[PDB]
Amino acid sequence: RRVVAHMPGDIIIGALFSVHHQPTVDKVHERKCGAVREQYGIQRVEAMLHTLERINSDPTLLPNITLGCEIRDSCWHSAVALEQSIEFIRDSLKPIVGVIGPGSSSVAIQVQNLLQLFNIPQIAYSATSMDLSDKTLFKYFMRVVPSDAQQARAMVDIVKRYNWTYVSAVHTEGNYGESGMEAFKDMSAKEGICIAHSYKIYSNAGEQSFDKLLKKLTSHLPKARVVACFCEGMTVRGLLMAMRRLGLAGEFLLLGSDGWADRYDVTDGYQREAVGGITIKLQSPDVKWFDDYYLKLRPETNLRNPWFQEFWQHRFQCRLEGFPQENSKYNKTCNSSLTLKTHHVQDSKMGFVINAIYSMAYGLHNMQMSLCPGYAGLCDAMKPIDGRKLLESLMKTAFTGVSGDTILFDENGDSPGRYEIMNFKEMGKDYFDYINVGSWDNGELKMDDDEVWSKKSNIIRSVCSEPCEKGQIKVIRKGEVSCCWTCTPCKENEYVFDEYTCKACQLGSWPTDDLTGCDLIPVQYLRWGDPEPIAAVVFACLGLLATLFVTVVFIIYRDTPVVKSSSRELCYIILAGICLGYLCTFCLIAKPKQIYCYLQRIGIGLSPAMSYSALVTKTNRIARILSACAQLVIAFILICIQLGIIVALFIMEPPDIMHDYPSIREVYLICNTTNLGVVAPLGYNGLLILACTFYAFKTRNVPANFNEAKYIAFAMYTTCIIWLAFVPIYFGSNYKAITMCFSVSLSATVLLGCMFVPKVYIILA
Amino acid sequence: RRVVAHMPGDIIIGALFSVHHQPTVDKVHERKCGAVREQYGIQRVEAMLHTLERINSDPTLLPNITLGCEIRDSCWHSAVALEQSIEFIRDSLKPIVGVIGPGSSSVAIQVQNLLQLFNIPQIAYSATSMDLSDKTLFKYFMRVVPSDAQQARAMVDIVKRYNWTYVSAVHTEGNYGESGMEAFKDMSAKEGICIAHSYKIYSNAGEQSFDKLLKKLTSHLPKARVVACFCEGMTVRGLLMAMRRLGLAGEFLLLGSDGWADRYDVTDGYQREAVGGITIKLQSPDVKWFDDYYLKLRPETNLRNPWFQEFWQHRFQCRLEGFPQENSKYNKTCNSSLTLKTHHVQDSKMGFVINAIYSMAYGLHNMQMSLCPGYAGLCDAMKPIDGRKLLESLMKTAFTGVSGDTILFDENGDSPGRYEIMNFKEMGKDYFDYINVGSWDNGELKMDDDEVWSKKSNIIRSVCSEPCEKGQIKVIRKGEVSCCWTCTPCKENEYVFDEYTCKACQLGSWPTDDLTGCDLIPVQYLRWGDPEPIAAVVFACLGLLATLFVTVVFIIYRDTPVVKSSSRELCYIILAGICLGYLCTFCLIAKPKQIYCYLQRIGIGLSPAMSYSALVTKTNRIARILSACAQLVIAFILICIQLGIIVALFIMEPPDIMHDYPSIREVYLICNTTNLGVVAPLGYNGLLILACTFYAFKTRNVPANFNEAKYIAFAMYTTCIIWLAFVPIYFGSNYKAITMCFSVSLSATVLLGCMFVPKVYIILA
Ligand SMILES: *[C@@H]1O[C@H](CO)[C@@H](O)[C@H](O)[C@H]1NC(C)=O
Ligand SMILES: *[C@@H]1O[C@H](CO)[C@@H](O)[C@H](O)[C@H]1NC(C)=O
């Protein structure tokens, strides 16, 4: 039978403390507990005994009634605690009025499911799972610590403070780990944080299980460098031991939980592996009087605590001869010089443990105040202490704590509390410590970024993909969590619509700077500058100068017989046409406008048709003579025919500015001239040429005034070749305007020359 | 205190049945449970009370000993069953040697946690959760049913059989539901399925909770019409009542589980809302001998069942006056003609229950054979029947069940089984029934897709997005779920790499039909024939005919005095040049090959070089005379110079066919004749032409033999412009071959016809 610590009194309060370690994986069925525990074990039993004797000593608390206790060992296992709890309720089948419940959430649940049936209030000090807040299933459960709803929030705040996104989660199998990791997963996923993969493990699992878990964790090593452990202390120690076994000394940052806190017994010997880990610890000041009472204990006199001599021997590895408990396993003997004052480490949850004992005390006081206000003691109205009344009194009680605050329970049975942030750092050489690098209260996280990462090179941000909003490149998912993206650049005509897709611009549009939006690329006109068209305009100007010189010479020598043989009007009509060619070239090269672009048509129609019409009549007259003024009229009508066709093409295609986009980039504006709108006048001009071919062959060479027929027959001859050669370039090209300009002013000069010069040259000579 | 059914015996076996319904949410703390049950309650009580008689009347099983029982009421509740289990184990503080576990997985876990402390084996008949298969924590627990693992697969198979991709998930709060939904989520997300959202709810929740759950379920209604309930019977009934309240009559198809099975009590009164639902039932044939005993039971004689009178009054709504259990709540009085034969339904899991007790019988039989073979009864080494030995002999028991099959426990305490897929249909007019429409066994899902949906217009498949495999389009996930995608059309250039990305083809390439792959586009070239080459080659052929005619006239009249002039050999060189130029095109306008394109450049380089150089020498002699046979010497060398440049341009750029791609759509092939490879021969030719233009202008009009020098005075004067006219066309175009073809023959023609034809002319004259 398991041993039990007793203390007499009028009212007896049960307490479950984990004096011994959890049963090993291969001895769960035997329910055999491992080694004794100091922080979680003997210290808590001593705290309970001393605080109860203090309560008995205090006259102002529970006067004239002495509080007893029955402390049992829970071994941090569900079955052992369940059997001890059955032992608690055995009399109810002096009764236990209340239990200072176990420190594990799963164990607390298992004990509560049994205690609630017999109306036994249970006050926990370390069980912090959210599930215990449900008063429908756990009516007889209270705690002096906050739930894990705030601890998960604190962990999420820590991960979101340091840009950590792609973390990996581990939690111990059990209610505490399960609930905590569920809360963390829920809160983090709503705030952009990410989980590579969530793992679970038992605290008592063998070395092989931890090795496998660490292998799975290293499977994401380059990217998921932060591990979030809603783990217990022994789970974290197992992870550290795995790191030691398979050579890992800084590949991970373990973001611990309340289980780890600042426990020195999870990093003993493995400090090098745990350096840089961040943990969350329930805020609890050191208790002075407990330290004063505890360090003065000796195994010779400490007979109340049945485990104490065993503790002595396991702690100071030695054996105590003059006692039953010798245990020769330990070679040497315990000299009367050992004391607990050396390397003494008070457990973090020592404030809470005492508080949970005061609660059940104060809750018993208040209930005694109401039941029998006058009587100072155990009144006859209190012989069968009622569990329901005691629970009610505990729910509405409030008292000053050991720390110096007020402990009180809300409607959910929980109690207010704040958290502390610790960083396990290497302070000196071969010396490590937990350093307080922040806190967390009522939703407000106030860290200290200087103490942790005393440099600008903090831990590599746990991210899956680098920030890739770098202009052209967009972000595409890969069928996994919306966490790890591949970055793809869209084409040049596409701009980023969102961070997720890239959208093409319009027909004549181009994306702006930073590809945030788009832009209608400006139209391109025929510029007056440039090296090419300046030559064309210079040529046109020279042609105009030649034409004005020609007209001056023609009018000065007006009535001379050497020029008064042919019609003066005919070779003034030709002059008007040759001038109109240059005028058409000049008005062609400009901004294509609703006022400008139809002059192109009139030029290209009349100029290369009307001049040849005036010429053909003269050639025919000279040929057939080898008449009168009537040849003028037949000339004019020959113009009018062409004047029809242009007008014929004017109706179907009105003068407008049409935009063409030969490529997706450049935009051009030109008049609406089409394939049919340039061939028909050119077709007629071909006929004009054809007409004069007839004559030119017939005339050939004829001795006239200055042998005009010798030269006028040749000006046409050099024109038809260029007219034909112009077709291939014009048909396929992007330079229609300049080509038209050069064509017109080319066949132009030719004519103006032999037409007039041969005559007017020698005339002036 | 609660009542309990008793039967005396040497060995006592307890049981936990939900005789009454779960306590309502407003009376859980009092632990008073609701109305009586027929299938899950009284029927199983009578099953135990008669199976024990059947065993006790069989000398072949447990001879000369009697099996008593202590049947307790668990009210389908964890707390009530834990209290009753405390009552069971109170003796160990006649002992209970083992129990028939409760029907609920959570309740089974709770009672196992207490029973394993006292080595009391527990056998379950419906506790199907896969949590209890862990023998580390649940050693003394066995069951005659498979795990939920198999059942979750059965569902996954069902959902993947009917294209159902986007479904909703609901499970009952507890272990059964939670474990089942975890398994289903795992093996569904792994294969192809996507869950819109997973919900949970307690069975004993209020109306408002179920209404809220249904409101959340209709949030995804247009897409996810299928809800997967790893829920309990009463959870499904609550869902149906919610559907009735807010007017849903066929928006959802409920995919139920073992909880639902073919229970008429979950779909009574609410058939309209459940029609079409598909449920999974553990297969167990109805035990025939149970009916012939049960149906003849009467409340007058059945005194050993404390719950029989309550049930009898609850079933036929009336009162039994002649009995203490009057229950004056009802109005009328039961006549002595009411029988259980009317509206009798035996529960699905009756055989299981029976087999469970049989499992305990043989375990208690195989023990007594092994412990004391000689004795027929309770031997001395068996008076304190060992729980450990009972469990050991139980795990290895193989026997025959009431169904006729063989019952045997695996290494984890489970037993094999198969599933029946049932469909709730409207058979007649106002008549609804469950129809067996399939089965599932070890991975084989047999089903009858015609009994359900006797048509092709089944339930609108629970899908999110329509298929995107419409050729060009591809799938884009927005970072929501992996089953709701948009369709993006790829451009005509790229081909679909996978379902989710499409990548561009090679620059010379094109996607094949259906965008499945990319194929090599065929190359184009200037084919023999065609519209323009058929006109171009006519020029070359006519030129060759003219050149042969002219050379015939030249060689015939070589010695005629009328040609005794500037060396006829020099002009013969020119004529050979024209012939070479005419044959240049025939190796130019063809299919590009190394043989053709190592001579094309030679031709263009030399043909307009050597002929023109010989013309230069001839005109040089003519001009300087106003020499001897050395003219060839000063001529020939010039040719070499040009040849040198060609050779200079041949070494740097070897003749090879390279593929030119004006755009992605078109492909051509041509040799490596580049811009730099054309200017240099053209530069030399232009320099030569300009050099001889001076002498051509010097000659002008010189009276020579038959005006020989006159024609070449002006004919050459044309060869400049046409060559010049060739320069732009060759630069900006895609027809660089045919342009060269036309230009080469167009140059010679003139020079040829005006230096070798006037000759033929006067030769004839
Ligand atoms: C990322 O963390 C840094 C501090 O390490 C700080 O800038 C901030 O918390 C995060 N960055 C942004 C842009 O918020
Ligand atoms: C969807 O289900 C049908 C029959 O229910 C069958 O074609 C197949 O299982 C699914 N469709 C495809 C294309 O796989």
Ligand SMILES: N[C@@H](Cn1oc(=O)[nH]c1=O)C(=O)O
């Ligand atoms: N917070 C834990 C309690 N706890 O876990 C440890 O590892 N130490 C410790 O006190 C729980 O809620 O169970």
Ligand SMILES: N[C@@H](Cn1oc(=O)[nH]c1=O)C(=O)O
């Ligand atoms: N199979 C369930 C139990 N169960 O719940 C019901 O509603 N019916 C029923 O048999 C389980 O494994 O817990």
